[PDB]
């Protein structure tokens, strides 16, 4: 039984889980809980961080004793699963578009993370006003790149379609208004939400839209 380990957060792990659900691959979900308020300690992880044989101990991690796989980097994990299930590029031309979108998606995660995890309230407002300036342009870039395609690379679904759903959804829940004039991307999310196994996943009583981030974060973090 392959094992995916992560916090009880959508976070970075959700794209991987969406891919797994889509591809029908069975896995055990190993979840870690933070400690109580007001410090939300990571003892649950830190007591085991070095006992799993991981080279670069981190969450998330992916372990498959049967295939001798033991990894710990989100993008490395998802690319590995994508390669296995044929959800990668088939030309160098496709691979370029895909890896750009991958990296554009990760860029959105870093700009969102640097704000949502900000401790100072005054700095949070500066970071947010600043984000509200930056994000429309990124979403328009994505809409343009997508055009009238069903998925980001065409009518074939790729691993970055799952990486883009999660981050776009998180942003959506942060501020609907950012999508007020982006029906193209809202239509795209709805297309993904209607893939059978995704519908199944989002319907599960395990699934909840929040928490997205850790309990120490200003946005998300709170069921």
99 binds a second copy (CB under 8 A): yes
When binding is defined by CB under 6 A, the residue of 104, 115, 158, 213 that contacts ligand GSH is 213
- In the bound state with a second copy, the residue whose beta carbon lies nearer, of 100 and 216, is 100
Note whether 15 binds ligand GSH by CB under 6 A.
Answer: no
5 is an interface residue for ligand GSH by CB under 6 A: no
DSSP-derived secondary structure for 79-112: HHHHHHHT-S-SSHHHHHHHHHHHHHHHHHHHHH
Closest distance to ligand GSH from the beta carbon of 213 (Å): 4
Q: What is the DSSP string of 110-163?
A: HHHHHHHT---HHHHHHHHHHHHHHHHHHHHHHHHHHTT-SSSSSSS--HHHHH
Q: Does residue 51 belong to the site contacting a second copy (CB under 8 A)?
A: no
Q: How far apart are the C-alpha atoms of 169 and 154, rounded to whole Å?
A: 20
Pick from 2, 8, 88, 95 the residue near a second copy by CB under 8 A. Answer: 95
Q: Which stretch binds ligand GSH (CB under 6 A): 8-16, 147-155, 178-186, 202-210?
A: 8-16
Residue 95 to residue 92: CA distance in whole angstroms: 5
Under the binding rule (CB under 6 A), the answer on residue 158 touching ligand GSH is: no
Per CB under 6 A, the list member of 2, 3, 54, 58 interacting with ligand GSH is 58
- 49 known ligand binder: yes
User: Are 182 and 140 in contact, with CB atoms under 8 Å apart?
Assistant: yes
The string of DSSP codes covering 30-93 is: EEE----TTT---HHHHTTTTSS--SS--SSEEEEGGGTEEE--HHHHHHHHHHHHT-S-SSHH
Please answer whether residues 42 and 34 qualify as being in contact, where contact means their C-beta atoms are separated by less than 8 angstroms.
Answer: yes
- Using CB under 6 A as the binding rule, whether residue 59 contacts ligand GSH is answered as yes
Write out the residues near ligand GSH by the rule CB under 6 A. 9, 11-12, 42, 45, 49, 58-59, 109, 113, 212-214
Q: Which segments are annotated as binding site for glutathione? A: 6-7, 42, 45, 49, 58-59, 74
Write out the residues near a second copy by the rule CB under 8 A. 55-57, 69, 71-76, 79-80, 83, 92, 95-97, 99-100, 102-104, 107, 110, 114, 119-120, 123, 126, 138, 141, 144-145
């Amino acid at each position: 039984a392959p094992i995916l380990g992560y916090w009880k957060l959508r976070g970075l792990g959700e794209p991987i889980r969406l891919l797994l659900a889509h591809t029908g691959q069975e896995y055990e979900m190993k979840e870690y809980s933070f400690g109580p308020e007001p410090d939300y300690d990571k003892s649950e992880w830190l007591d085991e961080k070095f006992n799993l044989g991981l080279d670069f101990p981190n969450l998330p991690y992916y372990i498959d004793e049967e295939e001798g796989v033991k990894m710990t980097q989100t993008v490395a994990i998802i690319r590995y699963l994508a390669r296995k299930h044929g959800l990668v590029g088939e030309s160098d031309e496709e691979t370029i578009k895909i890896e750009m979108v991958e990296q554009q998606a990760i860029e959105l995660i870093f700009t969102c993370t640097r704000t949502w995890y900000c401790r100072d309230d005054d700095l949070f407002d500066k970071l947010k006003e600043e984000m509200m300036t930056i994000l429309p342009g990124k979403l328009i870039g994505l809409a343009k790149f997508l055009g009238e395609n069903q998925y980001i690379i065409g009518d074939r679904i790729t691993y970055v379609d799952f990486m883009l759903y999660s981050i776009l959804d998180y942003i959506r829940l942060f501020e609907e208004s950012l999508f007020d004039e982006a029906s193209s991307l809202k239509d795209y999310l709805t297309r993904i939400e209607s893939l059978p196994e995704i519908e199944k996943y989002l319907s599960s009583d395990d699934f909840k839209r929040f928490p997205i981030t850790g309990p120490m974060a200003k946005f998300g973090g709170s069921s």
